[PDB]
Amino acid sequence: ALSVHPSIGVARLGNANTDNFVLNPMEIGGLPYEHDVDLKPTTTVVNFKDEAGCIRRQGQVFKVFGASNEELTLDSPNVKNIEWTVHLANKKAAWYEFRELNGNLLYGRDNSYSARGVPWRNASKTASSERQSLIIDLGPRSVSGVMATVEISINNIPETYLHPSYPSGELLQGSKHFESLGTLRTDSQGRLIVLGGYGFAGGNTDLSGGGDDWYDDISDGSVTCVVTYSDDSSETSTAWMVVGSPDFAPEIVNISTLSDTCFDVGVRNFDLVPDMYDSATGHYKSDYVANFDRDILPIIQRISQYQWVSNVQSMSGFFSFQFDYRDGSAANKANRMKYYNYFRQLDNKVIGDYDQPQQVLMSSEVEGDILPLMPMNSGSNSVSSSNFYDLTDNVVEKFLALDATQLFLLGQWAEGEFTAGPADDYPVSDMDTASIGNCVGLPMCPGIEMTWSLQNPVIYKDAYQIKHYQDKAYFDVNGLTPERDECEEETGCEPGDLTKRMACPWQADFFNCTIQTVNFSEPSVNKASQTETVTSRTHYEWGNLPAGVSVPDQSSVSATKNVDEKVPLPPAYYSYWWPPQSPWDVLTGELDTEGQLHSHLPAGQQINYARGINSYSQMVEHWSALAFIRDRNQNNDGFPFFTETERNHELFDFKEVLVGQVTGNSEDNETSLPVFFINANKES
């Protein structure tokens, strides 16, 4: 049997020239790679953007291996060809509107999209064929041989692909002309490289209601590899491919990655690690001995990086080594247990059950005993209350937890059931962790690359392996199924299934993936209506009048009533979304005069990552102008210094507003407010 790795590939959008790209990271938290003319990885990336300030695509290399785990290439004996067929699609315009956890079958059938009344995107299209044409699907492309290149283009749709679809003609807002979902290549030895979209995002309504008939060039889908041997026999093996938006901080790793997601699903559903979990009973095994370096240390290291992209100082006690994390002894147990007991336990997946650990913000509210519980971040629903969407039992999950496997292992550590030193690897290839370990695992509201369908074991045929629904001959004739939920049918995924739930266009997830102000007093409430009534009596009196003279006072009463229908219920806590993937609080990086003049800031100052992108619509147009957060001291392990690099400072205008301009008091002009923005006009 052959195997293809990675099992789930990851590419990232880029708007630079089609031929100007980097290759995939080779580890979790790894930089992507420059390459040579043979398309073999060389050194890590020099610049993420080209000279014009356009983002380079990141491509995924896939490799195929024989029965003894030896790599097969066009140079291997007895191999005469290797043909890769990749079928990517974007089903987002054909899917349901995103409503947090509604639609997620892990909470039971009563939380199905139908049971919850979730509406379809582009809801005026109700016939099946009209829904199918909302999908961006240009059919499968194939590549083989030495240094091949084929676009997944609207201009080379195979004649055997009977039902292609895409947004045709000139779009009225955003990107005008859709043309491509990406590019397939082979390297000098026949390996596959998949490159995804270009960052296209356009549509025919004003984003400003608005938002119908919009599209992006995110996609995902199947990978098929046929290796033909000298005698014309062959073997076939498969994988999946996902395209994400750019990784703007690739060295910073999510506390729970999508690799952690796949692993946890694997352990609890596919017997991936029999020693850790008893599939017969549905419980972890309390005699499982964790390993510090493999299981615990990465959590601590991930936590320690968030400071470069967010203000989460309350997490500092978890990477301080204020005591010895490697000491398994009974004398150190109360310390390890205290550390562990500050992590939020997982909520059950029961509808209507609100008083649960992920609705708890703090360890206590007694002064002296107050600490935000860990990890400190939004959960998968801090946005809608129990009573939204005409429901009374909408699922809430306000604050973050680790995944169940991470937390189990952390608890073994706390118990003293762990070792120090090397452990052997789990039975998961490194190539499989290196792709999706660079994608967000939690929270998922919806997420960045993928959302909570990936937590559902029914989409997998085994740990880390996406189950495929049907095959090329089926789709050739029928096209893709717009209304089919792979989580409901359980018989596999189609192209477009892994990304369809995400925002359409993705630049909305990016614009919103910042912070959330999250209520922490009422477990069933995220937002409430708020009425602010201000009643004012103005009284006038006149004086400094002559001794003869008196004038009557005057007074009147005025009131204002401001109603906001859905605001976070106080008291609330400032909570991050995805700092590694959508930075917020970052250090300025220009160390030379020219970059300081154009950015208007000195180096080393913490400022807002998205400053100047003042609207959703501006994010849709100008995403590519943002910085990549990177370690400026990368050559010296252990002494990181992450700053913005490669921001297109020339895009932004700037005004320094004196505080007395706002207040009317000129004494306040000793203080000023920097304001970044994009001049509407503006020309080069």
Added chain:
Amino acid sequence: ALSVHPSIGVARLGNANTDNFVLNPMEIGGLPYEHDVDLKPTTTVVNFKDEAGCIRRQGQVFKVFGASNEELTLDSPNVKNIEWTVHLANKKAAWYEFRELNGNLLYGRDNSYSARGVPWRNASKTASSERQSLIIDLGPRSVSGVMATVEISINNIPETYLHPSYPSGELLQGSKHFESLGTLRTDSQGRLIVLGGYGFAGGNTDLSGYGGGDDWYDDISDGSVTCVVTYSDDSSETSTAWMVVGSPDFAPEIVNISTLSDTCFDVGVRNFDLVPDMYDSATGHYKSDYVANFDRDILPIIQRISQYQWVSNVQSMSGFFSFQFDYRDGSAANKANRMKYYNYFRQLDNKVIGDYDQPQQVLMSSEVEGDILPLMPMNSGSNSVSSSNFYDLTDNVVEKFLALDATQLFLLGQWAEGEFTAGPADDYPVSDMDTASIGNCVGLPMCPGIEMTWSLQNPVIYKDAYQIKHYQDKAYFDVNGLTPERDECEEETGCEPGDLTKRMACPWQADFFNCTIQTVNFSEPSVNKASQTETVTSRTHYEWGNLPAGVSVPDQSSVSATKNVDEKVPLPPAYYSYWWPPQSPWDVLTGELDTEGQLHSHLPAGQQINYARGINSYSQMVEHWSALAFIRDRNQNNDGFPFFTETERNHELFDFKEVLVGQVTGNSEDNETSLPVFFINANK
């Protein structure tokens, strides 16, 4: 034969209690009247608004007279009954979009709505029956007897009227629920009083939205009046008139230089042989031996010009009422003076398509220093808005600057020639009651106007001078309803209800909001607006100095540009020109003389300020028109010594902020000066 007067009645909208109204002015520039319980006029209006600040409707009294010109009432011997039937309708939503002079057949058949491709309003309705339903038509109502009252309500449509229509249900924006076009009453002796609408303006699209404005309605109307007088012997005679409803007259003592009575009179002279001594119908020329009269013909013009200063800044017109020479001296010695006066008046443009270089495109007497004066009257003409090349046309009709009507100008010319008398002259053969209604409406310019537009200049809608020709009869409309696409000016067979007001803005509050000033180009006769592209190319250079000995750093410089493009703005050089100062004031004097009104208005008395201050958008005018002041003579008891100020403004609606200039400029030294800013909060 009977006659009904006025031939064209005028009522004004009001949102006060249905029972709380004033009666019509009795002369041009006359205040409306309070009335007694018998609905007879008593003395002129005390307050235009009720105690809540709601505007009182103005109703029109109609009287019927016998062959002897004796008034007939229920008290007349031989009169058994007087029965009035009034049919008002609003066809605005069913008519064409207003595009200045497009559609006006006085410019020839090539200027027809169809030749000019003017779109219908609510253009997605194309079937005749669907166009018909856009009309607000509740059928006719009748009234007779002593002190009768009948509403023109959606709840009392006669069963014989088969095709009523109106906007039913709850409107999404503005006024919610349409119910009535007005009220018919009789007085104690059986005279008719017509009261019009309540100021309703609502619709189902967002006015502030792009392309918004479809499916909007107001409660303006107009239509036919029929009077049947039944005598003791049960015989009867019938006679007819017309009725128009306009928006409030916010400065009723201030008269338009050319009123709608002037329009009807001009039409009558030129087309209906109204004054055979003035005009030769056989040759189509005025008679040069006609002797004008100063008091009747000339003086009113001078008096009207002298009032505009209360509502606009038109000081250049001051020489035309200065009596710097004796206007009543008809002698040769004063002729050069008279002629100089006359020669500062614009001659009328011919109405020939494509002929731009004409007198109404000329602003000044010359542009030679010492010889510069704006020609008269100094106001916008009937198209200072759209150029020759708009609306997909190449010869769109332009008329930039105002002229008198042809008859006023002829008479002024006779005065200049010395062909005029001083002293009384006998009236023209037009009833004073017919002048008193429409003499209080705008005659020129019409773009579109206030109460009515340029179809009133078309002789084909009249059956004689001042008399509207009626199309069909009551029975026809009972069965067929109104004809939505029918142009009375095209068919020449008379008017239907709704015809006199349908061309005006829908809602009228758009005409009121726009009826302010125009910045009018005066260099290119074919151009009103142009695109304007402003490109600003800026080199920023930095140098550093005061450095220690031996230290230098390089200069830095870079270049940036902005390109603003405004698509349709006035082409410079342009002139600040008024629209309708008497009917839509712009520069007016504050009027609050006690402390409370000053605190609420935020202004001392006697200061000239903007009339609409605080109504910062079109949508706010639609909602809050009734908050605006009435401009009136505070010194009305003293003939010759006028003092017009605002009165009755609903100051409490508006909020106020004083902005220091250094808030804008960033320079605190500028805070010695401030800018008043009025606005409407809404959360009030």
